[PDB]
Amino acid sequence: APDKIVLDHAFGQTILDKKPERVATIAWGNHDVALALGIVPVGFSKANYGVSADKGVLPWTEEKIKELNGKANLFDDLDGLNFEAISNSKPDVILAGYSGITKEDYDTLSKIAPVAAYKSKPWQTLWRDMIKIDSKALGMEKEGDELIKNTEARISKELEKHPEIKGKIKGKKVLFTMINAADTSKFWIYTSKDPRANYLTDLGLVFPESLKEFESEDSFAKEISAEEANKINDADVIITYGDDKTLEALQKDPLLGKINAIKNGAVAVIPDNTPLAASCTPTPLSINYTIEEYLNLLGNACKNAK
Ligand SMILES: [Cl-]
Ligand SMILES: [Cl-]
């Protein structure tokens, strides 16, 4: 101020004339940026992964809302953007820095309020950039930077607190994947532009050279054939969502069982549909809530590497 706020994103530019008071957010995580900055959204998207849709809000989010003496104002939008609900919240801005909105979505949303969209591609926003984009739209760029620094300090503290884990995982080559043990003919590898993959580097892990082959500006994950399985023998550890049958199934799999990380038992299985699984695409609030338990799980997997 007196400068307007000018946001550049995938769909052009958004201009705000002053700092927005009523904040709506959509899609994953963005509400946690507002909340970590001390603001209770006038509405935000419902969740049903790691929480029942009946509650509709993840535990770290609910806890911050209660600290701020607010309440959860949820858009009934599990089946897609609910434009009427958003419009009824009377927002001054819509935060969508990590999201999958289309141009049609963007145009419809912009009729309601200024929209902070992602920079280039849907679902390709790392956690620090989600904070940068979302906090700029709030006119709180400096506070967003302070939040990033504080979140980085939390990560560092948790690592220093458990030196054996930090030492075990440091420099280990990792891939975050989605593998369905019931059909291993194809599986997914999350790319370096996906926040759940890059978060692993914040913890001291690194990507293997094999990831570069699968990289593509066009998406946040690549579908890999079992025929290509051998390419990822350079991973020391693999992460996948799964359950209590996943590791055993993969080790007995006649297509993937020979892959080094799998053969060695160096597989971090993130229990499906839990708050921990939800937290793997991190937000400032989820990190503090889950980092000890995530590092413990990753550390235990890395013990089996080699
Ligand atoms: Cl979402
Ligand atoms: Cl606060």
DSSP 245-268: THHHHHHT-TTTTTSHHHHHT-EE
State which amino acid sits at residue 55.
K
d(CA 81, CA 22): 19
Nearest to 101 by CA among 33, 30, 49, 50: 30
CA 188 / ligand 2 centre spacing (Å) = 37
Task: Name the residue with tokens 């280039």.
Answer: 120
CA 125 / ligand 1 centre spacing (Å) = 13
State which amino acid sits at residue 216.
S
The DSSP letter of residue 293 is H
Structure-token pair, residue 263: 């053969």
Ion ligand 2: protein residues whose beta carbon lies under 5 Å: 38
CA 39 / ligand 2 centre spacing (Å) = 7
Residues in the chain, overall count: 306
CA 225 / ligand 1 centre spacing (Å) = 27
Q: Domains of the chain by range and CATH?
A: 1-139 (3.40.50.1980), 141-306 (3.40.50.1980)
- Resolution of this entry in Å? 1.7
Could you tell me the sign of the dihedral formed by the alpha carbons of 284, 299, 162, 202, in that order? Answer: negative
> Which ligand gives the minimal distance to the CA of 285?
2
State which amino acid sits at residue 11.
F
Nearest to 181 by CA among 281, 264, 260, 254: 254
CA 99 / ligand 1 centre spacing (Å) = 7
Structure-token pair, residue 131: 């904070």
> Which ligand gives the minimal distance to the CA of 98?
1
CA 227 / ligand 2 centre spacing (Å) = 50
d(CA 261, CA 150): 34
Q: Is the peptide bond before 2 cis (omega within 30 degrees of 0)?
A: yes
> Which ligand gives the minimal distance to the CA of 122?
1
